[PDB]
PDB file of C-alpha atoms and ligand atoms in Angstrom:
ATOM      1  CA  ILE A  28       5.782  -3.309   9.614  1.00 41.35           C
ATOM      2  CA  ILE A  29       5.316  -5.636  12.636  1.00 45.83           C
ATOM      3  CA  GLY A  30       6.605  -9.278  12.711  1.00 42.76           C
ATOM      4  CA  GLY A  31       8.570  -8.674   9.504  1.00 39.78           C
ATOM      5  CA  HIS A  32      12.279  -8.538   8.499  1.00 38.20           C
ATOM      6  CA  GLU A  33      14.569  -5.957   6.808  1.00 39.30           C
ATOM      7  CA  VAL A  34      14.656  -6.589   3.070  1.00 38.20           C
ATOM      8  CA  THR A  35      17.969  -6.747   1.109  1.00 38.70           C
ATOM      9  CA  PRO A  36      18.670  -3.140  -0.027  1.00 41.11           C
ATOM     10  CA  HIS A  37      16.599  -2.425  -3.193  1.00 39.97           C
ATOM     11  CA  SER A  38      15.243  -6.035  -3.451  1.00 39.73           C
ATOM     12  CA  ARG A  39      11.666  -4.563  -3.879  1.00 37.22           C
ATOM     13  CA  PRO A  40      12.448  -1.760  -6.441  1.00 38.32           C
ATOM     14  CA  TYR A  41       8.711  -0.976  -6.840  1.00 37.36           C
ATOM     15  CA  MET A  42       8.384   0.520  -3.282  1.00 36.53           C
ATOM     16  CA  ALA A  43       7.571   4.223  -2.990  1.00 37.70           C
ATOM     17  CA  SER A  44       7.736   6.601  -0.061  1.00 36.93           C
ATOM     18  CA  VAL A  45       5.184   9.413   0.064  1.00 38.30           C
ATOM     19  CA  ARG A  46       6.755  12.260   2.166  1.00 43.17           C
ATOM     20  CA  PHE A  47       4.826  15.240   3.640  1.00 42.48           C
ATOM     21  CA  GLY A  48       6.846  18.090   5.076  1.00 45.49           C
ATOM     22  CA  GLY A  49      10.084  16.100   4.646  1.00 45.87           C
ATOM     23  CA  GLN A  50       8.772  13.174   6.762  1.00 43.58           C
ATOM     24  CA  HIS A  51       7.646   9.752   5.482  1.00 43.33           C
ATOM     25  CA  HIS A  52       3.879   9.470   5.847  1.00 44.20           C
ATOM     26  CA  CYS A  53       2.772   6.644   3.474  1.00 43.86           C
ATOM     27  CA  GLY A  54       3.903   3.843   1.180  1.00 42.74           C
ATOM     28  CA  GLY A  55       2.942   2.971  -2.389  1.00 42.87           C
ATOM     29  CA  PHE A  56       4.231   1.405  -5.595  1.00 42.42           C
ATOM     30  CA  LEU A  57       5.499   2.311  -9.062  1.00 46.26           C
ATOM     31  CA  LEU A  58       2.907   1.215 -11.625  1.00 41.46           C
ATOM     32  CA  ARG A  59       4.563   3.197 -14.463  1.00 37.34           C
ATOM     33  CA  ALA A  60       7.677   5.465 -14.699  1.00 36.64           C
ATOM     34  CA  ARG A  61       5.348   8.388 -13.846  1.00 34.25           C
ATOM     35  CA  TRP A  62       2.472   6.557 -12.006  1.00 34.61           C
ATOM     36  CA  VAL A  63       2.312   5.609  -8.313  1.00 33.67           C
ATOM     37  CA  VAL A  64      -0.524   3.629  -6.727  1.00 33.42           C
ATOM     38  CA  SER A  65      -1.341   4.501  -3.059  1.00 34.40           C
ATOM     39  CA  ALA A  66      -4.201   4.774  -0.484  1.00 37.43           C
ATOM     40  CA  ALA A  67      -6.545   7.819  -0.689  1.00 41.72           C
ATOM     41  CA  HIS A  68      -6.579   8.279   3.147  1.00 42.49           C
ATOM     42  CA  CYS A  69      -2.849   9.309   2.979  1.00 38.99           C
ATOM     43  CA  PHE A  70      -3.684  12.711   1.419  1.00 38.06           C
ATOM     44  CA  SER A  71      -6.718  13.505   3.583  1.00 44.26           C
ATOM     45  CA  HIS A  72      -6.315  17.180   4.707  1.00 45.83           C
ATOM     46  CA  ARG A  73      -2.841  17.671   3.110  1.00 43.77           C
ATOM     47  CA  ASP A  74      -1.254  20.287   0.824  1.00 44.35           C
ATOM     48  CA  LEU A  75      -0.127  18.457  -2.329  1.00 46.69           C
ATOM     49  CA  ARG A  76       2.714  21.022  -2.819  1.00 49.69           C
ATOM     50  CA  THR A  77       4.420  19.748   0.414  1.00 49.69           C
ATOM     51  CA  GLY A  78       4.278  16.181  -1.024  1.00 51.03           C
ATOM     52  CA  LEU A  79       7.311  14.240  -2.395  1.00 53.08           C
ATOM     53  CA  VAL A  80       7.584  10.724  -3.914  1.00 53.19           C
ATOM     54  CA  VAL A  81      10.878   8.894  -3.306  1.00 47.91           C
ATOM     55  CA  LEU A  82      11.773   5.771  -5.294  1.00 46.72           C
ATOM     56  CA  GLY A  83      14.928   3.659  -5.091  1.00 48.32           C
ATOM     57  CA  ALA A  84      15.171   3.972  -1.291  1.00 46.50           C
ATOM     58  CA  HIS A  85      16.119   1.579   1.490  1.00 46.42           C
ATOM     59  CA  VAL A  86      17.135   3.930   4.398  1.00 47.15           C
ATOM     60  CA  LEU A  87      14.847   6.995   4.220  1.00 45.36           C
ATOM     61  CA  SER A  88      17.189   9.181   6.347  1.00 46.46           C
ATOM     62  CA  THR A  89      20.067   8.547   3.864  1.00 43.01           C
ATOM     63  CA  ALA A  90      20.461  10.494   0.599  1.00 43.83           C
ATOM     64  CA  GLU A  91      21.037   7.219  -1.317  1.00 51.22           C
ATOM     65  CA  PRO A  92      22.513   7.555  -4.859  1.00 52.00           C
ATOM     66  CA  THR A  93      19.754   5.184  -6.145  1.00 53.47           C
ATOM     67  CA  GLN A  94      16.998   7.510  -4.786  1.00 54.04           C
ATOM     68  CA  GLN A  95      14.833   9.494  -7.234  1.00 52.89           C
ATOM     69  CA  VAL A  96      12.643  12.228  -5.682  1.00 51.05           C
ATOM     70  CA  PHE A  97       9.532  13.535  -7.614  1.00 55.64           C
ATOM     71  CA  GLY A  98       6.673  15.953  -7.015  1.00 54.91           C
ATOM     72  CA  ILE A  99       2.949  15.161  -7.495  1.00 58.48           C
ATOM     73  CA  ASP A 100       1.491  16.795 -10.704  1.00 59.63           C
ATOM     74  CA  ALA A 101      -1.960  15.308  -9.985  1.00 58.57           C
ATOM     75  CA  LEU A 102      -3.595  13.234  -7.259  1.00 59.92           C
ATOM     76  CA  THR A 103      -6.615  11.186  -8.319  1.00 59.79           C
ATOM     77  CA  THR A 104      -8.599   9.943  -5.348  1.00 60.61           C
ATOM     78  CA  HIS A 105     -11.194   7.288  -6.145  1.00 60.60           C
ATOM     79  CA  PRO A 106     -14.555   9.117  -6.840  1.00 61.88           C
ATOM     80  CA  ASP A 107     -16.276   6.764  -4.287  1.00 61.97           C
ATOM     81  CA  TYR A 108     -13.605   7.006  -1.518  1.00 58.99           C
ATOM     82  CA  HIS A 109     -15.536   7.268   1.795  1.00 55.46           C
ATOM     83  CA  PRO A 110     -13.105   8.274   4.632  1.00 53.22           C
ATOM     84  CA  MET A 111     -15.168   6.910   7.606  1.00 53.20           C
ATOM     85  CA  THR A 112     -15.577   3.309   6.342  1.00 51.41           C
ATOM     86  CA  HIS A 113     -12.293   3.295   4.276  1.00 48.93           C
ATOM     87  CA  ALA A 114     -14.299   2.063   1.181  1.00 51.13           C
ATOM     88  CA  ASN A 115     -12.504   2.476  -2.195  1.00 52.85           C
ATOM     89  CA  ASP A 116      -9.329   3.604  -0.329  1.00 51.27           C
ATOM     90  CA  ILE A 117      -7.177   3.931  -3.452  1.00 52.97           C
ATOM     91  CA  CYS A 118      -5.565   6.812  -5.381  1.00 49.87           C
ATOM     92  CA  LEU A 119      -3.177   7.425  -8.268  1.00 49.78           C
ATOM     93  CA  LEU A 120      -0.158   9.728  -8.262  1.00 46.42           C
ATOM     94  CA  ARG A 121       1.002  11.230 -11.602  1.00 46.83           C
ATOM     95  CA  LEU A 122       4.574  12.508 -10.905  1.00 46.74           C
ATOM     96  CA  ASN A 123       6.188  15.716 -12.338  1.00 46.37           C
ATOM     97  CA  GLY A 124       8.548  13.490 -14.362  1.00 46.69           C
ATOM     98  CA  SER A 125       9.393   9.885 -15.270  1.00 44.73           C
ATOM     99  CA  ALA A 126      11.498   7.571 -13.082  1.00 42.43           C
ATOM    100  CA  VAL A 127      14.565   6.156 -14.808  1.00 40.71           C
ATOM    101  CA  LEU A 128      14.028   2.395 -14.343  1.00 37.96           C
ATOM    102  CA  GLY A 129      17.029   0.433 -13.103  1.00 39.50           C
ATOM    103  CA  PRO A 130      18.058  -2.266 -10.600  1.00 35.62           C
ATOM    104  CA  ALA A 131      16.895  -0.109  -7.627  1.00 34.44           C
ATOM    105  CA  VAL A 132      13.709   1.382  -9.269  1.00 33.06           C
ATOM    106  CA  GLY A 133      11.192  -1.022 -10.846  1.00 35.19           C
ATOM    107  CA  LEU A 134       7.515  -1.669 -11.671  1.00 31.75           C
ATOM    108  CA  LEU A 135       4.928  -3.857  -9.922  1.00 33.57           C
ATOM    109  CA  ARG A 136       2.202  -5.624 -11.974  1.00 32.65           C
ATOM    110  CA  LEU A 137      -1.485  -5.200 -11.085  1.00 31.20           C
ATOM    111  CA  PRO A 138      -3.685  -8.392 -11.103  1.00 35.57           C
ATOM    112  CA  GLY A 139      -5.521  -9.174 -14.359  1.00 34.72           C
ATOM    113  CA  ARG A 140      -8.747  -7.406 -15.472  1.00 34.59           C
ATOM    114  CA  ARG A 141     -10.523 -10.811 -15.306  1.00 32.83           C
ATOM    115  CA  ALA A 142      -8.586 -11.952 -12.137  1.00 33.48           C
ATOM    116  CA  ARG A 143     -10.335 -12.938  -8.864  1.00 34.94           C
ATOM    117  CA  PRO A 144      -8.926 -11.981  -5.389  1.00 33.93           C
ATOM    118  CA  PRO A 145      -6.807 -14.704  -3.630  1.00 32.49           C
ATOM    119  CA  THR A 146      -8.451 -17.425  -1.445  1.00 32.09           C
ATOM    120  CA  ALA A 147      -7.965 -17.889   2.334  1.00 32.37           C
ATOM    121  CA  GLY A 148      -4.492 -19.267   3.173  1.00 33.22           C
ATOM    122  CA  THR A 149      -2.687 -17.734   0.117  1.00 34.27           C
ATOM    123  CA  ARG A 150       0.848 -16.654   1.178  1.00 33.09           C
ATOM    124  CA  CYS A 151       1.520 -12.931   0.593  1.00 35.14           C
ATOM    125  CA  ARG A 152       4.088 -10.282   1.590  1.00 32.84           C
ATOM    126  CA  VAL A 153       3.623  -6.720   2.918  1.00 33.89           C
ATOM    127  CA  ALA A 154       6.509  -4.123   2.925  1.00 34.48           C
ATOM    128  CA  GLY A 155       7.040  -0.603   4.293  1.00 34.58           C
ATOM    129  CA  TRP A 156       8.835   1.953   6.496  1.00 36.56           C
ATOM    130  CA  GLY A 157       6.109   2.122   9.130  1.00 35.22           C
ATOM    131  CA  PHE A 158       6.520   1.384  12.850  1.00 33.55           C
ATOM    132  CA  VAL A 159       8.027  -1.994  13.897  1.00 36.50           C
ATOM    133  CA  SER A 160       6.358  -2.066  17.361  1.00 37.48           C
ATOM    134  CA  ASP A 161       3.541  -0.492  19.427  1.00 36.99           C
ATOM    135  CA  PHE A 162       6.212   1.893  20.885  1.00 35.39           C
ATOM    136  CA  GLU A 163       6.563   3.969  17.642  1.00 34.91           C
ATOM    137  CA  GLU A 164      10.001   2.391  16.954  1.00 34.15           C
ATOM    138  CA  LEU A 165      11.279   3.133  13.472  1.00 32.00           C
ATOM    139  CA  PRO A 166      12.728   0.460  11.161  1.00 31.53           C
ATOM    140  CA  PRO A 167      16.453   0.321  10.138  1.00 34.81           C
ATOM    141  CA  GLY A 168      15.192   0.318   6.511  1.00 31.21           C
ATOM    142  CA  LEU A 169      12.425  -1.090   4.236  1.00 30.66           C
ATOM    143  CA  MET A 170      10.856  -4.006   6.157  1.00 29.33           C
ATOM    144  CA  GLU A 171       8.733  -6.934   4.870  1.00 29.16           C
ATOM    145  CA  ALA A 172       6.353  -9.398   6.632  1.00 27.08           C
ATOM    146  CA  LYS A 173       5.105 -12.839   5.557  1.00 26.07           C
ATOM    147  CA  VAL A 174       1.299 -12.979   5.872  1.00 28.26           C
ATOM    148  CA  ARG A 175      -1.541 -15.295   4.719  1.00 26.73           C
ATOM    149  CA  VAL A 176      -4.904 -14.168   3.231  1.00 28.53           C
ATOM    150  CA  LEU A 177      -7.646 -14.477   5.893  1.00 25.71           C
ATOM    151  CA  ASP A 178     -11.240 -15.670   5.169  1.00 24.41           C
ATOM    152  CA  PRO A 179     -13.483 -12.622   4.414  1.00 22.57           C
ATOM    153  CA  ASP A 180     -16.350 -13.712   6.726  1.00 19.26           C
ATOM    154  CA  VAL A 181     -14.045 -14.355   9.754  1.00 18.87           C
ATOM    155  CA  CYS A 182     -12.536 -10.900   9.141  1.00 17.47           C
ATOM    156  CA  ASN A 183     -15.902  -9.141   8.634  1.00 15.61           C
ATOM    157  CA  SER A 184     -17.097 -10.756  11.920  1.00 15.20           C
ATOM    158  CA  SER A 185     -13.973  -9.512  13.815  1.00 15.96           C
ATOM    159  CA  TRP A 186     -14.641  -6.032  12.294  1.00 15.09           C
ATOM    160  CA  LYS A 187     -18.340  -6.092  13.468  1.00 14.45           C
ATOM    161  CA  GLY A 188     -19.687  -6.184   9.870  1.00 15.75           C
ATOM    162  CA  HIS A 189     -17.796  -3.081   8.634  1.00 16.33           C
ATOM    163  CA  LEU A 190     -15.990  -4.667   5.667  1.00 18.00           C
ATOM    164  CA  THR A 191     -16.951  -3.856   2.076  1.00 20.51           C
ATOM    165  CA  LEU A 192     -16.957  -6.472  -0.733  1.00 20.12           C
ATOM    166  CA  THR A 193     -13.821  -4.739  -2.184  1.00 19.32           C
ATOM    167  CA  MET A 194     -11.704  -5.364   0.974  1.00 23.43           C
ATOM    168  CA  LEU A 195      -9.373  -8.286   1.807  1.00 22.20           C
ATOM    169  CA  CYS A 196      -7.707  -9.503   5.075  1.00 20.64           C
ATOM    170  CA  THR A 197      -4.529 -11.177   6.225  1.00 22.33           C
ATOM    171  CA  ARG A 198      -3.384 -13.143   9.265  1.00 23.41           C
ATOM    172  CA  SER A 199      -0.034 -14.482  10.460  1.00 18.82           C
ATOM    173  CA  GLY A 200       1.312 -17.885   9.412  1.00 18.17           C
ATOM    174  CA  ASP A 201       2.157 -18.639  13.066  1.00 20.38           C
ATOM    175  CA  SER A 202       1.458 -17.437  16.658  1.00 21.42           C
ATOM    176  CA  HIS A 203       3.393 -14.133  16.169  1.00 23.41           C
ATOM    177  CA  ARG A 204       1.679 -10.835  15.242  1.00 25.79           C
ATOM    178  CA  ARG A 205       2.608 -10.118  11.580  1.00 27.17           C
ATOM    179  CA  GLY A 206       1.240  -7.375   9.387  1.00 28.53           C
ATOM    180  CA  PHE A 207       1.447  -3.676   8.693  1.00 27.92           C
ATOM    181  CA  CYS A 208       1.577  -0.717  11.139  1.00 30.24           C
ATOM    182  CA  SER A 209       1.315   3.137  11.123  1.00 27.79           C
ATOM    183  CA  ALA A 210       2.880   4.668   7.883  1.00 26.71           C
ATOM    184  CA  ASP A 211       2.779   1.430   5.790  1.00 24.23           C
ATOM    185  CA  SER A 212      -0.514   2.798   4.274  1.00 28.25           C
ATOM    186  CA  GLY A 213      -0.727   2.800   0.478  1.00 24.96           C
ATOM    187  CA  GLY A 214       2.043   0.195   0.197  1.00 24.57           C
ATOM    188  CA  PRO A 215       1.094  -3.034  -1.582  1.00 24.24           C
ATOM    189  CA  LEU A 216       0.295  -6.586  -0.486  1.00 23.74           C
ATOM    190  CA  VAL A 217       2.112  -8.821  -2.962  1.00 22.32           C
ATOM    191  CA  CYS A 218       0.492 -12.200  -3.696  1.00 19.14           C
ATOM    192  CA  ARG A 219       1.936 -14.366  -6.485  1.00 18.85           C
ATOM    193  CA  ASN A 220       4.003 -11.375  -7.804  1.00 20.15           C
ATOM    194  CA  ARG A 221       0.890  -9.134  -8.172  1.00 18.90           C
ATOM    195  CA  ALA A 222      -0.343  -6.122  -6.135  1.00 22.12           C
ATOM    196  CA  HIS A 223      -3.615  -7.716  -4.868  1.00 21.23           C
ATOM    197  CA  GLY A 224      -3.840  -5.502  -1.768  1.00 20.69           C
ATOM    198  CA  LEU A 225      -3.131  -1.960  -0.552  1.00 24.26           C
ATOM    199  CA  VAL A 226      -2.568  -1.112   3.125  1.00 24.91           C
ATOM    200  CA  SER A 227      -5.767   0.488   4.464  1.00 25.18           C
ATOM    201  CA  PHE A 228      -6.421   0.024   8.242  1.00 23.06           C
ATOM    202  CA  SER A 229      -5.665  -2.056  11.405  1.00 20.55           C
ATOM    203  CA  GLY A 230      -6.679  -1.916  15.132  1.00 22.48           C
ATOM    204  CA  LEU A 231      -4.954  -0.196  18.117  1.00 20.36           C
ATOM    205  CA  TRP A 232      -2.265  -2.861  18.261  1.00 20.80           C
ATOM    206  CA  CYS A 233      -0.248  -3.536  15.145  1.00 18.53           C
ATOM    207  CA  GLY A 234      -0.657  -7.071  13.794  1.00 19.66           C
ATOM    208  CA  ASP A 235      -3.251  -8.003  16.492  1.00 20.28           C
ATOM    209  CA  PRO A 236      -5.378 -10.963  15.166  1.00 20.61           C
ATOM    210  CA  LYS A 237      -8.447  -9.659  17.140  1.00 19.26           C
ATOM    211  CA  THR A 238      -8.407  -6.559  14.799  1.00 21.19           C
ATOM    212  CA  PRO A 239      -7.113  -8.049  11.452  1.00 18.82           C
ATOM    213  CA  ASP A 240      -5.195  -6.160   8.761  1.00 17.42           C
ATOM    214  CA  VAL A 241      -7.524  -4.624   6.170  1.00 19.69           C
ATOM    215  CA  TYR A 242      -6.247  -4.032   2.600  1.00 22.62           C
ATOM    216  CA  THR A 243      -7.955  -2.558  -0.456  1.00 21.91           C
ATOM    217  CA  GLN A 244      -8.854  -5.428  -2.851  1.00 22.65           C
ATOM    218  CA  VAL A 245      -6.866  -4.215  -5.918  1.00 22.00           C
ATOM    219  CA  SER A 246      -8.369  -6.585  -8.610  1.00 20.57           C
ATOM    220  CA  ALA A 247     -11.648  -4.568  -8.374  1.00 20.07           C
ATOM    221  CA  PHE A 248      -9.794  -1.325  -9.284  1.00 21.75           C
ATOM    222  CA  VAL A 249      -7.674  -2.541 -12.262  1.00 20.59           C
ATOM    223  CA  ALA A 250     -10.117  -1.096 -14.837  1.00 19.99           C
ATOM    224  CA  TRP A 251     -10.414   2.269 -12.979  1.00 17.35           C
ATOM    225  CA  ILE A 252      -6.580   2.473 -12.566  1.00 15.62           C
ATOM    226  CA  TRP A 253      -5.961   2.109 -16.354  1.00 13.49           C
ATOM    227  CA  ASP A 254      -8.879   4.482 -17.183  1.00 11.85           C
ATOM    228  CA  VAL A 255      -7.228   7.240 -15.058  1.00 13.36           C
ATOM    229  CA  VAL A 256      -3.796   6.466 -16.608  1.00 11.01           C
ATOM    230  CA  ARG A 257      -5.075   6.586 -20.266  1.00  9.35           C
ATOM    231  CA  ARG A 258      -6.967   9.910 -19.533  1.00  8.46           C
ATOM    232  CA  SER A 259      -3.654  11.843 -18.854  1.00  7.48           C
ATOM    233  CA  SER A 260      -1.668   9.969 -21.570  1.00  4.19           C
ATOM    234  CA  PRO A 261      -0.840  11.156 -25.152  1.00  4.82           C
TER     235      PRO A 261
HETATM  236  C1  LIG B 303     -20.169  -7.806   6.536  1.00  5.26           C
HETATM  237  O1  LIG B 303     -21.165  -8.266   7.439  1.00  5.26           O
HETATM  238  C2  LIG B 303     -22.349  -7.456   7.510  1.00  5.26           C
HETATM  239  C3  LIG B 303     -23.249  -8.152   8.498  1.00  5.26           C
HETATM  240  O2  LIG B 303     -22.601  -8.276   9.751  1.00  5.26           O
HETATM  241  C4  LIG B 303     -23.368  -8.898  10.736  1.00  5.26           C
HETATM  242  O3  LIG B 303     -24.635  -8.244  10.888  1.00  5.26           O
HETATM  243  C5  LIG B 303     -24.613  -6.896  11.401  1.00  5.26           C
HETATM  244  C6  LIG B 303     -26.033  -6.382  11.377  1.00  5.26           C
HETATM  245  C7  LIG B 303     -23.975  -6.892  12.792  1.00  5.26           C
HETATM  246  O4  LIG B 303     -24.753  -7.654  13.712  1.00  5.26           O
HETATM  247  C8  LIG B 303     -22.566  -7.471  12.688  1.00  5.26           C
HETATM  248  O5  LIG B 303     -21.963  -7.526  13.975  1.00  5.26           O
HETATM  249  C9  LIG B 303     -22.579  -8.867  12.066  1.00  5.26           C
HETATM  250  O6  LIG B 303     -21.247  -9.349  11.901  1.00  5.26           O
HETATM  251  C10 LIG B 303     -22.997  -7.311   6.132  1.00  5.26           C
HETATM  252  O7  LIG B 303     -23.975  -6.276   6.195  1.00  5.26           O
HETATM  253  C11 LIG B 303     -21.970  -6.977   5.048  1.00  5.26           C
HETATM  254  O8  LIG B 303     -22.573  -7.110   3.762  1.00  5.26           O
HETATM  255  C12 LIG B 303     -20.762  -7.910   5.130  1.00  5.26           C
HETATM  256  N1  LIG B 303     -19.777  -7.550   4.125  1.00  5.26           N
HETATM  257  C13 LIG B 303     -19.188  -8.433   3.322  1.00  5.26           C
HETATM  258  C14 LIG B 303     -18.093  -7.893   2.458  1.00  5.26           C
HETATM  259  O9  LIG B 303     -19.507  -9.617   3.304  1.00  5.26           O
HETATM  260  C1  NAG B 304       9.253  18.201  -9.232  1.00  3.62           C
HETATM  261  O1  NAG B 304       8.663  18.560  -7.975  1.00  3.62           O
HETATM  262  C2  NAG B 304       9.566  18.903  -6.908  1.00  3.62           C
HETATM  263  C3  NAG B 304       8.705  19.229  -5.705  1.00  3.62           C
HETATM  264  O2  NAG B 304       7.650  20.139  -6.014  1.00  3.62           O
HETATM  265  C4  NAG B 304      10.475  20.056  -7.332  1.00  3.62           C
HETATM  266  O3  NAG B 304      11.427  20.304  -6.303  1.00  3.62           O
HETATM  267  C5  NAG B 304      11.187  19.725  -8.645  1.00  3.62           C
HETATM  268  O4  NAG B 304      11.932  20.855  -9.097  1.00  3.62           O
HETATM  269  C6  NAG B 304      10.170  19.325  -9.715  1.00  3.62           C
HETATM  270  N1  NAG B 304      10.839  18.976 -10.958  1.00  3.62           N
HETATM  271  C7  NAG B 304      10.425  19.402 -12.163  1.00  3.62           C
HETATM  272  C8  NAG B 304      11.270  18.987 -13.330  1.00  3.62           C
HETATM  273  O5  NAG B 304       9.414  20.088 -12.304  1.00  3.62           O
HETATM  274 CL1   CL B 305       4.302   6.430 -17.699  1.00  5.53          CL
END
């Protein structure tokens, strides 16, 4: 996260860390005790057996007593996920057990089934353990930035017409670069206490307004998300 601040330890109990080969690789959120929502691009060319989901974390390099580590029993990539364009960049993680919900491990609500995406100017927050600068500097813990939803046409223009109808954009509230960075992928964009976005892709320079922050528009996937959950439920 660039242009953000370190959250109070465990103040966002919904945050997940997807680890590959012991290292943090992506973010995500706890939808249900055993369900994690993330970005499909995070698992592209990766052995699911080397994957771990950590919940209840603040400092990833610390074996925190609030941390709960789970394996991935199933990965469900969106059927229409196109890696080149980043279209339908969403996936669901069914863990090899259920998280014990507490003050450090919680759930995040999806937008409604009949809910529209937020309008330009809507204040949102993005969190993660991704880089804090363009010099691959690591955060002291789970960071969070204050962003504002950016007009879809202004964004699509900046992106040379490469945005899909199911993608939203953010900008900073001021003159400082604020947004996500490498390894914040999959982690949610929280608008009005709902996961409206999902970290997808940026430019070369983290938080650069010339190459705005692209998130997966979550409201479009609410129906799919519950369909996949129900399918593997008793
Ligand atoms: C995004 O915009 C696309 C059109 O972009 C414009 O036209 C193309 C041919 C290029 O000249 C480009 O530089 C221009 O910005 C649309 O095809 C597409 O539907 C738009 N997507 C959304 C979500 O509105
Ligand atoms: C869950 O998965 C992890 C990683 O594969 C493994 O270490 C752990 O033993 C598993 N737990 C159960 C109950 O299967
Ligand atoms: Cl569940």
